[PDB]
Each structure stands twice: as structure tokens, then as C-alpha cells.
Amino acid sequence: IKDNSILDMRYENNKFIDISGYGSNISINGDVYIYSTNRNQFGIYSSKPSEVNIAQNNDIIYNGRYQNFSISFWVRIPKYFNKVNLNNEYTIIDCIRNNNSGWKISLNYNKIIWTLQDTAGNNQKLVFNYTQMISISDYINKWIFVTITNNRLGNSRIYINGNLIDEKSISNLGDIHVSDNILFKIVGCNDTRYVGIRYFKVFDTELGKTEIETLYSDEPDPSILKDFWGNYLLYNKRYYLLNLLRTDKSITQNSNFLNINQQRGVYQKPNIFSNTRLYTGVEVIIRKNGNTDNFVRKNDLAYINVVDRDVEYRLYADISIAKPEKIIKLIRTSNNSLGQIIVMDSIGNNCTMNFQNNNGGNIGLLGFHSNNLVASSWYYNNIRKNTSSNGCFWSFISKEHGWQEN
């Protein structure tokens, strides 16, 4: 609960502010990127002046040895692509006093690291391990929710996306005097890099499982759908399509049809990364039908078109087919609904698209049947419960700096 928060970083009126009430002063030095669609998201750089500093309220600088506390925030880490990234630990969030007591969040190739140390020098480390040798990653260049909880007379725990990952006793810990400041700055990184950070908070209690799941599900506006990277999905923006069941397949334009039988392919660099190609297949765009923003929200009505060199083709469910699988056809488009619309929605972070006629009657969920995309009513009564592996689940991939390919 917000009642136990002693530091709440938000962006407002072109600067960061602490809305917890303790009033810590937050200053931005150098070049700090602020995301346009969600100002609470910022990026810091490793090779040039760039940092966000929080001069903690004196009454918050924990010098105790019994005080319980927790921290949470989301971090966005670009794909590592150089050998210099392999064994190069660097801190991104620092609250260490005179190179000794305190806590800090650092990173390294395939790692997110938490360190907690006392005045004597004793410390404890928690680490989340992930990989770059994987077809599709839930971590690389995507917002990752991190949560550290500490019970002085118990354990220190690190959570990732709401789940418990590592846990160790901090009983060997005595007096812990944190730094007066909480510095967001990439320090010790031997490469030219940056990291994204959002919704950083500190609590004076040991957050429980249920309070962590709440922070995970609420912080970012839950009514707005998300793209592949975890950012807000937008109208009038090009995206590549990824089917969550057949993640190895590319969605291609055949004639006036859409195939999903071709391989996306693999992009790799020996001993650094190996992943299926994301930027392949047709580029689509989401268009509004007949407000103050371009955010695609749950239940919104919209049109989906393939963007082919300045020509847009509306995705049309061929309702002239009696079978439940109505192949998707491409029809050159501007306001003609063609007798149908698409209901945008999602189960978790999994996007769904439901083709319906004008009277609100269901035609079918976008999916595939043989080797083609189709709108099928079969999905309504055939969705696997807790798994993204459903032919009617999709992700929209925007080509961005944090993930480069051929």
C-alpha cells in the first residue's frame, strides 16, 4: 500500500518529483531521455553526462539495523552485442555510502544484481539470471519489473515480474547506513550503453507477495494495451506481427492472402546472442474508426491494415466462407468499414483481435488455420488458460534502437 511508501518518483511539469510526502529533492543532470508516451520512463547513458539524483530527506536516510524496507521499479536493458559486455558489471542505481555501507542495483551480461552491505563490510548478493541464447525473450530490451524486499530479522528477496527469484538471509548484517542520495547513473560500464527506468519507489516495510503483484499489475495504465517491448500500443504506428503460438513463423503477403508458414529466421553472434528474427514479414498499422491521444485501449474498435510502400490494405475476414475459419483477405483502402470492425483487447500482455460485423455480431478471432491467417470463432471456446501459446494471441513489434538485426 502507498501508505508504506517513503519515496515515490513521478514526472510532472518537466521534472521529477517525490510524491510520498517526505519531499526528497530529485534533480536531473546531463542528458536524460524522457519517453514521450509515458513520462515516468527515462533513460540514462553510460558514456556521457547523464544522471537522475535523489537527495533523500534526512528523515529517510536509514542508518538503522532493524528497519525493514523494500524497493521496486522497472528496468529496460538493451540486447548486449559486444564482447566487452560479457564480464562488465556496472551499477545503475546507487545508494552506497563512501564505497562501503548501503545498497545498489547493478547489471552485467545476463544479470540483474542487488547488493546490500553493512558498515563492517559484510554484504549479501541476490541475482536474477536470464539469457541471450533464446528464440523469444521476455527480458531483453523489455520492461522488467524488479522488487527487492528486506526483513532485517529475516531474508532479502528479489522478485522479477511479481515472482520470487532468489532469497538469502541478511542475518550476518549489522549496521547499514545508506547514502544520502539515490543516484541513477550508469557507472563502470566499459561500453556505450543506456538503460531505461520507470516507477522507482521505496517502502519502509517488507512488501508482501500480494502487494507486489498489485504494483506489477497497476503502475502502468492497465487499460492501455502494450506492444512487444512493454510500451503503450499506439494507433498510426508501424509494427511487425508476431504470433505467440507459432513464434518461429513470419507473416507474409502472398497474393491477397496472409501466410504464416515462412520461417522468421535466426539472427546470431557467436557466444553473445542467438534469437529468432523479429523484424520480418509484413508491417501493419492500427487505425481508429469513426480522441486526445493515440493509445490503443482494451475494447477499442479499430481497423488493421498492411502497409505496403505507401499503400494500405485493410485486413478483411472473408465471410463468404461458411467454414468457421474465414481466411483473411487484403483489400486496398478510407472510412469504409467494409461491414466489419476489429475489437482490440488482451489476456495478460497477449493482444487479441476480434473481427465483428456492424451489429456487434462476432465473426472470429484473428488467428491461423492451415498456413494462412484467419478469423475463427473456434477460439472463443478453445483458449488455453494460463499460457501465451494460443494461435489467437499476437504481439506488435516496433523496430527500435535497443534491438538491432540484419
Ligand X SMILES: CC(=O)N[C@@H]1[C@@H](O[C@@H]2O[C@H](CO)[C@H](O)[C@H](O[C@]3(C(=O)O)C[C@H](O)[C@@H](NC(C)=O)[C@H]([C@H](O)[C@H](O)CO)O3)[C@H]2O)[C@@H](O)[C@@H](CO)O[C@H]1O
β-pair type (373-376, 394-397): unpaired
Query: Could you tell me if 184 and 53 are in contact, meaning their C-beta atoms sit under 8 angstroms apart?
Result: yes
Grid cell in block for residue 358: 456492424
Question: CB of 391: closest distance to ligand X in angstroms?
Answer: 3
Q: Nearer Cβ to ligand X, position 291 or 381?
A: 381
How many degrees, rounded to 5, is the angle at CA 108 between CA 99 and CA 65?
Answer: 40
Shortest distance, position 328 Cβ to ligand X, whole Å: 12
Query: Between 284 and 374, whose beta carbon lies closer to ligand X?
Result: 374
CB of 245 to ligand X, least distance (A): 6
Residue 13 or 320 with smaller CB distance to ligand X: 320
Which C-beta is closer to ligand X: that of 71 or that of 245?
Answer: 245
Let me know: does 40 contact 197? Beta carbons within 8 Å: no
216 to 255, contacts with ligand X by CB under 6 A?
A: 245
Give the CA count within 13 Å in the CB-facing half-sphere of 37: 17
Catalogue the E-assigned strands of 257-393.
258-263, 266-269, 273-276, 283-288, 301-308, 311-317, 325-332, 340-347, 350-357, 362-368, 373-376
| Number of helices and strands in the chain (H, E) | 1, 30
- Minimum distance of ligand X from residue 369's CB (angstroms): 4
Report in angstroms how near the CB of residue 251 gets to ligand X at its nearest. Answer: 14
| Residues near ligand X (CB under 6 A), total | 9
The residue among 85 and 376 lying less far from ligand X, judged by its C-beta, is: 376
Q: Among 287, 398, 395, 404, which Cα is nearest to 349's?
A: 395
265: left (phi over 0), alpha (psi -120 to 50) or beta: left
Kindly tell me which residue out of 162, 174, 324, 402 binds ligand X, with binding defined by CB under 6 A: 324
Task: Report CA-CA distances (Å) from 322 to 318, 326, 365, 375, 391.
Answer: 9, 8, 16, 12, 21
Residue 325 interacts with ligand X (CB under 6 A): yes or no: yes
Q: Binding pattern to ligand X, positions 349-388, x when CB under 6 A?
A: ------------------xxx------x-x----------
Nearest approach in angstroms of CB 252 to ligand X is 17
What residues contact 353, with CB distance under 8 A and at least 6 apart?
A: 304, 342, 343, 344, 345, 365, 366, 394
Q: How far apart are CA 82 and CA 66, in angstroms?
A: 42
Cβ-based nearer residue to ligand X, 48 or 384: 384
User: Is 253 or 371 the residue whose CB approaches ligand X more closely?
Assistant: 371
To ligand X, the closest distance from the beta carbon of 267 in angstroms equals 24
- The residue whose grid cell reads 522478485 is 159
Per CB under 6 A, which of residues 85..104 are in contact with ligand X?
none
Q: At its nearest, how many Å lie between ligand X and the CB of residue 363?
A: 12
Q: Which residue has the cell 478471432?
A: 365
- CA 234 to chain CA centroid, Å, is 15
- C-alpha cell recorded at residue 346: 488482451
Choice between 181 and 340, CB closer to ligand X: 340
Q: How far is the CB of 367 from ligand X (least distance, A)?
A: 5
Q: How many residues does the chain have?
A: 406
Q: How far is the CB of 397 from ligand X (least distance, A)?
A: 20
Nearer to ligand X, 39 or 369 (CB): 369
The owner of cell 513464434 is: 247
- The answer to whether the CB of 139 falls within 8 A of the CB of 72 is no
Residues 118-177 that bind ligand X (CB under 6 A): none
Return the number of the residue (340 or 376) whose C-beta is nearest ligand X: 376
**Binding footprint of ligand X on the chain (CB under 6 A):** 245, 324-325, 367-369, 376, 378, 391
